RNA sequence: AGUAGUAACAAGAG
RNA sequence: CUCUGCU
């Protein structure tokens, strides 16, 4: 645990809630005013979220999922599924978004377990994760620490505060606006070995007093569902072609890279990625949906899905008609307020409109 | 005795005494569900939360005496605290693991018997056979199937009565088992369930599952029997089919139904062949039902069906020339009839389209408790002589004959709520619906049918609507014989090239025309093992696979169509499609499409790959010259006429230009590779026979014209015609 | 199968 | 002897009273 | 199954404005016979209330407008791409061991 | 190189990849704090759409009521609650004409349901407002409280067991001049009795409880839902029964059918419209919800529809069907918890109940709440706001879809009397309408006619979020149709993972969910294997049931390791006992106990499947091998799973937070009730399997059964003379206890 | 502080 | 000092 020091009592919001008293005992208080229900103050989009997504779509040399062993395959369909699952696991285990899935799931499950078991004490929770490097080694890695505060979580929306301290090699000075909520300390020097030689680099510690709700932790533990949202879609995009060709096209799609889908935009135009790139991109999208989940994301996703259907009808020469398009746009735009993920999705949708009607 | 002691203790407590005394047995159903706790809205979150506390589980108080409070490691298995809202105490999962580890073992030989259904699943999966997996454009249709076949002989109520007998013999009440099946199953179950400590409630629930039939609407693609539905996830997929044969015995009814379906599909497909007998023989020798070859099931399955009979005749097996209807086996002793659909209005002001049999004919009706001789004309019961053993059997035979007559008063006798479409709006069989309705109640039918004067016909006393025998009066054309008149003989027959079955004398016994036109679903998965695997599939599958085959072979199909289209049209791969094309319109559609193809060939440019794909299947049949103009081509699909539009985009046949992909009935069929020689340039020249499509109208050659009347144009002149989805276009009668 | 595509996070120190 | 190969519908009849 | 007392008053009050009693409304609706009331009302309604269809062409959809406040800041519970990890060769295994002793 | 997942739609059509547009991996947006603001906003909005109606004051409850029926015709496209009685009656008449006898047959079916429906039917349903406690209670608990109060008040006509008798008692209660209830106050437990006047009981019998819909996806802003009292639900059940009977007879009404029944019915109907449409006719399909549908479906129009439907029926049947719309037209909406006021300078919290908003000063509120309170103050009465117009989260979904389908049928060419015509599908507030007309102008004219007719009937199409395209692709109740329904797996993602019933039920449910998704939602086999692996991992972590051979440390690890060493056949161990996972695509339909039965050790098999283990607890048959699952969209679903009852079929701890509240007595009463019921089952084993019957008290039935059982056991020799003597003496003692009292 | 967003948590009841 | 973590 962690002695309840002044610094932890402040960072974890100890005794910050007002005392709950009967209304008749405080009706005469001068500034007794209803809670503040002001509209979230809107913010702007920044390139850092796009860089975060770009990295989440990257390939890592270390495997991140070690799945249990299912019953031995007997049916020929089971063998085909096993081969396809081998391809999917090879493509996904090395995805950075899979690392995000694992670290988030571990953090959320540890936080919830500590929250339930130790509801009065500040608990130290290391940020651990497990990978298998491409040489078979099974390195156990530490990302930092989480000091969970008091966790008398009554409602599913009740908040437990925790101080998160993460190591990093990125100087916040470069992009201060991204780290408005962090107090970053320079705590070490890391002698990184590179191709030319060795370079000495500072090592910082991003510290912030974050918070999480019981429902948020519960959905964090189930971040592995993202793996399905992506992989199922990929399978749905493979099976269709395999039905058309009357053959199993998993090998052709993964090894031969015959089929590519428009997956990104560069200055040269639209870039086409293979099935693996598309799988990683969808996995990253689902992972970020889980990480940056919020009512803004849900509302924008629904309304933009409706607009996507309209644009698809336009693309299919179904001469779509609208009764109030400006109303639909206003409904969509009302869901873009603060969350960087939703703003990035809105910019993505704008780009897709630009490249879809040209 | 423990329970009476507990009752005495409860009466001792004042408040519990008041509850017990005041509340009645009827009011128990209400206070039994009296709970302060509310259903958890997100149980997953609560469970994740509660697995972190020490004692999330609740167990009976007795646990405290039959499990140590802590194990050798000191971890507290259970606690003293009492569960909220009950007398159960709190317990940790450690307690459960401890019980499974070093707990009091007992005998479990009874478990397979009480959980018979689950262990039957295990056993029939153990002995199942796995064939190759085939990647095909699977077309799954949503339809009601059975997940629990139940004990067919026993209706739900009989199953409940048997369950009460077996599990709660004293609480049966006044009920007594009458059906012999009830007695035998009750006996065997009681013998098996001897000294079964399992909770009676669980035994009752498992027996309900085992005995009571349960159905479910599920998207399926193979057999609809339970043995195939439970493994539906394993067998049928989006793009693949896993040929699987569940082990164990198979219900004879399911095999009979699947054989009927397979025979119907094979004969319907074989009619459109150039050599129907040889084609039918090949599909019989290449088809398997439920993993069993179809060649060797006919010689061992006597199910009566004009299609089954045609198949048997093709193999030299003696046929019966009989067919089931309303539970009675009908054998046409004399007469002949022709099928033709016709619309009728029922007595409940509902409009039906029923298949009337034109022609005088005579049948012999054989039933389990009745036998009759019938003579009928078109929607007219000329005569009926019944010989039922009891009044109920006589009434059943009379009602079946009445419905089989298809008489107008029969149709107009419908009263009350009778629906001819299920909750999925699928068209039910009108004859079966009428049979069910009239068997439920027949007073109106007999009242509205008519009475005929009857003389003293020896041993043929008349019957009246009230079911009492009468001598002077009787139901029109209905007599009851006491001679117990009571066909099965299998007469050897010769079947010609065109599947016309003739006996020794030479009269046509069976022909493909009288084969049923319904497209039913097999109870057992049917596998076809030729090069084109989809010959005997349903309508949607045939359409999708035909267009997919055209797409795949498009490289050679183009060249064959350009230099030798007659052989392209001959291509057998289009025959099942033609089987879907109505017989009446087959020749005219073929002629129209062939003329359009020839004009497309003659006209320089104007090549349209998508149009050729759309219209090629219709060209298989021999041409029939005509001047009629077709706005759409019709194909039969489960009793509905799907209209493939000649010009434009329709749900049946779609070409997405953005993806350059063709979808049929919502199922992808592939993409068409870009053809530099297409060059549509607006002008199509492959829509109207003898007309060229200039394009958008210009309102100078005429306001608009209809497709059919447009034939008035002689030659050369240009006019505006309303062709397509409200898109008037300019056209001209081709120079030649 | 080795995935491919056409270390400040996890360096060697 | 006399047997029904396949009997559809509910059967019976309420007319008998 | 009668309606009387309090339910009678509630029924009387729960009627269209012109009617005054439940039995009167029942008599009116029982004798009701369609006579083109819907068409007459459709004629009466102003022409402005209509479901005008504006075609959605390739030039119809404008780009979405994003808020123009201060740039959005990181809100994830942990660093995503900037996170640095201190690891060890120790193979051990996932879920095995004491995370603190590993840390 | 900026990767953009949305650009995937440039190649894959939106529908085929619609699953990507669902963020359901993340947590749904929950509601924090009170729902009083949302309820006030709903009441004000409902009264705003009907402001041009007639204002009256109820003579019984004394609350102001607003009647928009036959109000001024709409002059703008905004939602309007001015429904025309003539137009709705005309729509119903034409529905009857086009479907002869539908009303008559439906009325007879409802007649038989009403005859054969018992009070116990009201036990189904959840979170039913309990007027006796002014809070939401389980439907069975609220029903029991209401029955007890009625009995204490002399309403002793409900013991017949028939629902209609209970409704008669409900009316008799409202007609009573006074009422007596029992409430607990702690200051020590005090079973106080409260006397309610006629007007107060009337207000609290028409009251509608309100809360905030939690875990609702696709909406940025939260909305308030409502649950009715016990008096209302009785008539609501019959009304819904009749409306559902009518709906089953309508081709365009897909609400009663659900799941794959719903999808098949919709597919068939859309196919029929595409078929019967003329080839030369231009065809279009409109997708849209109806804006403020619940707020505008006036209950007076529902009364008119019921009265028309019940034409020529027995007067008592008309009464039984028409009572519910009457009560709803005079309904009241509870505000809710209230608000929370904070003082930063003094740093204190307080919660102000919603009952004291009719008098509290307005300076304590922010602007929005200030104006909502100002606008709703006239409607506030005894802590509830009068909500006569509109239908706040009404349960008349069946009746509403009947009205929608009636308007939908109004589009037949025999009714339009023009070239254009329309049909489609209706379900609650959602509709998919197909228009066929020779030209685009005809399509537009038909669209305008349908929209204006809906405005006439009170249905307001949402032009904001509805769009029209060429027939062939559309959307309906989150079902995306693209020339054929496409599987949208993202909807079923939340169902995956640990359900949280118990170890056995949760394994069975997980494997069954994977299998069902393979069958229905196009879950490929490799993805199925993935889902199985991930579910097993999550199951093991949640239940601390990792394999014994593993070194993972958990409070259950020691016992699992000991069991692992104990067993000879490791493969036979269940996953809950550290055994390996033998599941695969082959055997997703087989319960684990049966799958591993042959591999189980004999002693382990006996211990696991010991019927006398204390962990297994069995309630009535209706709660056996079944679970309630909540999908991302739609109401609760009853999912049945195949599971062998073993020691793992235990019950999780029950929320004890009621122990430190004034209402603990209800919990105590529940305990005692169970103590009695379980003993009744000890005397009548079939009570659980099928509901028992009788009029005598439980004690009489049990003692008579004990006596007869003793005599039979003696005759069979199962008990000796002394045992029979003791049983008889105890029975006589029980008789004396009952007599003395 | 911080979570979060139209109202709340930052423990609550004895 | 006791109780509760969906009441
Ligand atoms: O499930 C289908 C069918 O198998 C697919 C099944 N079935 C048929 N036979 C058996 C059987 O022997 N054993 C089992 N277990 N199942 C059997 O029952 C269903 C059959 O109905 P369906 O396929 O939906 O349509 P259809 O085959 O046409 O049945 P139905 O319309 O009731 O007619 C049955 C026979 O009656 C002939 N028929 C009717 N009329 C009025 C006449 C007539 O006036 N003259 C003549 N010559 N024949 C008539 C029908 O043509 C059909 O042959």
Short mmCIF file of N, CA, C and O in Angstrom, two decimals, chain B residues 137-139 540 544 650-654 662-669, chain F residues 16 271 472 481-486:
data_model
loop_
_atom_site.label_atom_id
_atom_site.label_comp_id
_atom_site.label_asym_id
_atom_site.label_seq_id
_atom_site.Cartn_x
_atom_site.Cartn_y
_atom_site.Cartn_z
N UNK B 137 -21.05 -20.58 -52.85
CA UNK B 137 -21.83 -19.38 -52.59
C UNK B 137 -23.10 -19.77 -51.84
O UNK B 137 -24.20 -19.86 -52.40
N UNK B 138 -22.94 -20.03 -50.55
CA UNK B 138 -24.05 -20.48 -49.73
C UNK B 138 -25.14 -19.42 -49.68
O UNK B 138 -24.87 -18.23 -49.51
N UNK B 139 -26.39 -19.85 -49.83
CA UNK B 139 -27.56 -18.98 -49.74
C UNK B 139 -28.43 -19.53 -48.63
O UNK B 139 -29.17 -20.51 -48.83
N UNK B 540 -33.21 -19.64 -55.25
CA UNK B 540 -32.22 -18.58 -55.05
C UNK B 540 -30.81 -19.10 -55.28
O UNK B 540 -29.99 -18.43 -55.93
N UNK B 544 -28.18 -17.69 -58.14
CA UNK B 544 -26.88 -17.14 -57.76
C UNK B 544 -25.76 -17.94 -58.40
O UNK B 544 -24.81 -17.38 -58.95
N UNK B 650 -32.44 -3.85 -60.96
CA UNK B 650 -33.50 -4.37 -60.12
C UNK B 650 -32.90 -5.24 -59.03
O UNK B 650 -31.85 -5.86 -59.24
N UNK B 651 -33.58 -5.39 -57.89
CA UNK B 651 -33.00 -6.18 -56.79
C UNK B 651 -32.61 -7.59 -57.19
O UNK B 651 -31.67 -8.14 -56.61
N UNK B 652 -33.31 -8.20 -58.14
CA UNK B 652 -33.00 -9.58 -58.52
C UNK B 652 -31.62 -9.67 -59.17
O UNK B 652 -30.89 -10.64 -58.96
N UNK B 653 -31.25 -8.67 -59.97
CA UNK B 653 -29.99 -8.69 -60.72
C UNK B 653 -29.39 -7.30 -60.66
O UNK B 653 -29.88 -6.38 -61.32
N UNK B 654 -28.32 -7.15 -59.88
CA UNK B 654 -27.70 -5.86 -59.63
C UNK B 654 -26.26 -5.82 -60.11
O UNK B 654 -25.50 -6.76 -59.87
N UNK B 662 -21.44 -7.79 -59.39
CA UNK B 662 -22.80 -8.24 -59.64
C UNK B 662 -23.32 -9.01 -58.42
O UNK B 662 -22.68 -9.96 -57.96
N UNK B 663 -24.47 -8.58 -57.90
CA UNK B 663 -25.13 -9.22 -56.78
C UNK B 663 -26.49 -9.71 -57.22
O UNK B 663 -27.25 -8.96 -57.85
N UNK B 664 -26.81 -10.96 -56.90
CA UNK B 664 -28.08 -11.58 -57.27
C UNK B 664 -28.84 -11.91 -55.99
O UNK B 664 -28.36 -12.68 -55.15
N UNK B 665 -30.03 -11.32 -55.85
CA UNK B 665 -30.88 -11.54 -54.68
C UNK B 665 -30.18 -11.14 -53.38
O UNK B 665 -30.45 -11.70 -52.32
N UNK B 666 -29.27 -10.18 -53.46
CA UNK B 666 -28.51 -9.76 -52.30
C UNK B 666 -27.29 -10.59 -52.01
O UNK B 666 -26.61 -10.33 -51.01
N UNK B 667 -26.99 -11.59 -52.84
CA UNK B 667 -25.82 -12.44 -52.67
C UNK B 667 -24.80 -12.08 -53.73
O UNK B 667 -25.12 -12.07 -54.93
N UNK B 668 -23.58 -11.79 -53.30
CA UNK B 668 -22.53 -11.42 -54.25
C UNK B 668 -22.25 -12.58 -55.20
O UNK B 668 -22.23 -13.74 -54.79
N UNK B 669 -22.02 -12.25 -56.47
CA UNK B 669 -21.72 -13.25 -57.48
C UNK B 669 -20.38 -13.03 -58.16
O UNK B 669 -19.99 -13.85 -58.99
N UNK F 16 -21.84 -3.71 -46.13
CA UNK F 16 -21.01 -4.89 -45.94
C UNK F 16 -19.97 -4.70 -44.84
O UNK F 16 -19.50 -5.68 -44.26
N UNK F 271 -39.96 -7.96 -50.16
CA UNK F 271 -39.92 -8.69 -51.42
C UNK F 271 -41.28 -8.63 -52.12
O UNK F 271 -41.34 -8.49 -53.35
N UNK F 472 -34.56 -0.94 -52.72
CA UNK F 472 -33.57 -1.99 -52.76
C UNK F 472 -32.67 -2.04 -51.55
O UNK F 472 -32.24 -3.11 -51.13
N UNK F 481 -30.65 -3.25 -44.56
CA UNK F 481 -31.03 -4.05 -45.71
C UNK F 481 -30.33 -3.49 -46.94
O UNK F 481 -30.49 -2.31 -47.27
N UNK F 482 -29.55 -4.33 -47.61
CA UNK F 482 -28.90 -3.98 -48.87
C UNK F 482 -29.24 -5.09 -49.85
O UNK F 482 -28.46 -6.03 -50.03
N UNK F 483 -30.40 -4.98 -50.49
CA UNK F 483 -30.88 -6.02 -51.39
C UNK F 483 -30.96 -7.37 -50.69
O UNK F 483 -30.93 -8.42 -51.34
N UNK F 484 -31.08 -7.35 -49.36
CA UNK F 484 -31.01 -8.53 -48.53
C UNK F 484 -30.31 -8.20 -47.23
O UNK F 484 -29.24 -7.57 -47.25
N UNK F 485 -30.88 -8.61 -46.10
CA UNK F 485 -30.32 -8.24 -44.81
C UNK F 485 -28.88 -8.72 -44.69
O UNK F 485 -28.55 -9.86 -45.05
N UNK F 486 -28.02 -7.85 -44.17
CA UNK F 486 -26.61 -8.15 -43.96
C UNK F 486 -26.36 -8.33 -42.47
O UNK F 486 -26.98 -7.65 -41.64
#
